[PDB]
Amino acid sequence: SLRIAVTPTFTSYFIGPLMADFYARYPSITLQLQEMSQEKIEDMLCRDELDVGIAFAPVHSPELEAIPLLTESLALVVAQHHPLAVHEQVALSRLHDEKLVLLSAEFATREQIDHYCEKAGLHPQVVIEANSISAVLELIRRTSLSTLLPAAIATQHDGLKAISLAPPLLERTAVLLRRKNSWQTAAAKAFLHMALDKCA
Amino acid sequence: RGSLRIAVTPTFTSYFIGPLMADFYARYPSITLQLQEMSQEKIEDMLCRDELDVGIAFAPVHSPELEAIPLLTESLALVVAQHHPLAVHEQVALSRLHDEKLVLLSAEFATREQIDHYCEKAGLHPQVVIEANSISAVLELIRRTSLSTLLPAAIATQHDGLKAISLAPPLLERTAVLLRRKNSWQTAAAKAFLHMALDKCA
Numbered sequence: 001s002l003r004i005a006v007t008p009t010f011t012s013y014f015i016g017p018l019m020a021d022f023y024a025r026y027p028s029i030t031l032q033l034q035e036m037s038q039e040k041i042e043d044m045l046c047r048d049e050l051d052v053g054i055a056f057a058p059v060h061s062p063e064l065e066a067i068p069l070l071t072e073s074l075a076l077v078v079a080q081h082h083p084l085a086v087h088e089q090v091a092l093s094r095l096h097d098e099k100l101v102l103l104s105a106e107f108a109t110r111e112q113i114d115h116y117c118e119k120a121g122l123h124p125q126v127v128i129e130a131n132s133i134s135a136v137l138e139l140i141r142r143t144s145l146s147t148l149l150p151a152a153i154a155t156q157h158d159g160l161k162a163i164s165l166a167p168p169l170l171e172r173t174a175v176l177l178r179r180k181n182s183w184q185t186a187a188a189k190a191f192l193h194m195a196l197d198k199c200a
Numbered sequence: 201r202g203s204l205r206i207a208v209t210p211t212f213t214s215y216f217i218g219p220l221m222a223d224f225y226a227r228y229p230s231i232t233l234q235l236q237e238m239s240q241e242k243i244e245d246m247l248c249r250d251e252l253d254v255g256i257a258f259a260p261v262h263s264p265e266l267e268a269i270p271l272l273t274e275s276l277a278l279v280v281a282q283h284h285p286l287a288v289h290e291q292v293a294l295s296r297l298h299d300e301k302l303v304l305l306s307a308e309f310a311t312r313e314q315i316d317h318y319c320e321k322a323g324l325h326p327q328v329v330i331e332a333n334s335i336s337a338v339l340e341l342i343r344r345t346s347l348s349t350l351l352p353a354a355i356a357t358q359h360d361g362l363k364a365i366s367l368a369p370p371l372l373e374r375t376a377v378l379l380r381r382k383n384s385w386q387t388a389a390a391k392a393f394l395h396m397a398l399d400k401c402a
Contacts, residue, residue, distance in 0.1 A: 016340030
C-alpha cells in the first residue's frame with residue numbers, strides 16, 4: 001500500500017510514467033497518488049500519512065531527508081501554431097508582449113513566477129487564470145496564448161512546444177522526500193530506486 | 201471590458217470547459233477569465249457569496265438562492281487505452297467490471313462517491329489497485345497500463361489513445377447544470393457565457 005504525494009507540476013510529466021512502470025513491475029502493490037502543496041506533503045510525511053513525496057529544495061522540515069532528483073526549469077509553453085513556436089529559445093523580454101494563461105496564486109509555481117518576473121522587471125498581461133495545469137494546457141492548445149510552465153511538460157504533449165527563455169526565469173531542484181530514521185518498506189525503496197534510475 | 205469568474209466540478213475540466221473558454225476568449229478577448237475546479241458544495245457556497253459569476257455542477261442543487269439550467273447528461277463509461285482487451289467493444293455488460301482492475305479518483309470526489317454507491321447497489325465490487333486525486337493522473341495511468349477507470353465517456357473523445365466503452369445497464373447518469381444566483385443580475389459577459397455553454401450542448 002504505497003502512498004505517494006507530489007507537487008502539481010510532477011503530475012503533468014513525471015509521476016504518470018514512473019507509477020505506470022512501477023505498477024507493471026510490481027502489480028501486487030496497491031498505489032495511492034495525491035498531488036498537493038509541498039507544505040502538506042512535508043506535514044503528512046511527518047505524520048506517517050505518506051511513504052514518499054516529491055517536491056523541491058529547500059525542505060522546511062528537519063525530520064525529512066531530501067534526495068536530489070532533477071532540475072525543473074520554466075519555459076514559455078505554446079501551441080505549434082503560436083508565433084514563437086518557430087524558435088527553440090527566446091529572449092526573456094519577449095514575455096512583455098505575451099498574453100498569458102497562468103496557474104492561480106495558490107500554486108507555488110505561480111508564486112515563483114510572479115516573484116522572478118517582478119525581479120526581472122517583467123509584467124506580462126495575464127488574461128486567463130486556472131487552478132489546474134490540465135486546464136491551462138487545454139487553453140494553450142486551443143488558442144494563441146502562452147503559459148509559463150516546466151519545459152518537461154511540453155515533451156509529453158504533441159501539439160505543445162516549450163520555448164527556452166534566454167536568461168532563464170526559474171530553475172528549481174526537485175527532491176524525493178522520506179521521513180528520516182523511520183524505515184521504508186521494500187516497495188518504497190524500490191520506488192525511490194526507480195525514480196532515480198529514470199532521472200539518471 | 202469586464203471579468204468572468206467560472207467554477208466547475210472536476211469532470212468538466214477534462215472535456216467541457218477547455219473548449220468553451222477557448223471559444224469564449226477568442227470571441228471576447230477583452231474579458232479576463234478566471235477558472236477554478238472545486239467541489240459542488242464550494243461552488244454553491246461561493247455563488248451565494250457573489251464570489252463567482254457562473255458555476256457548472258450537477259442536479260440536485262442544494263441552495264435555494266441558486267437557479268439551475270440543465271446543460272447535458274454525463275454518463276460514466278469504462279475508459280481504457282486502445283491496447284486494453286475490451287477496447288475492441290463499443291459496449292460491454294456491467295458485470296465485466298468484476299474482473300477489471302481499476303484506477304479511480306479518491307473518496308473526496310463526488311464522482312468516486314457515486315461510483316461506490318451505484319456499484320454497491322448493482323452488486324459490483326471491482327478491485328481498485330490505484331487511487332489518485334487527479335483526473336489527469338488517472339488518464340496517464342490508463343494510457344500506460346492495461347488498467348481501466350470509470351469516467352464520463354466524453355473524456356475519452358478528447359484523447360486519442362483512450363476509448364470509452366459503454367456499460368450495458370448504465371452505471372451512473374447525471375444531469376450537468378449551469379448555476380447562477382437568482383435575482384442577482386448578470387453581466388453581459390456572464391450572459392454571453394451561458395448562451396455559448398448552451399449552444400455547444402445544443
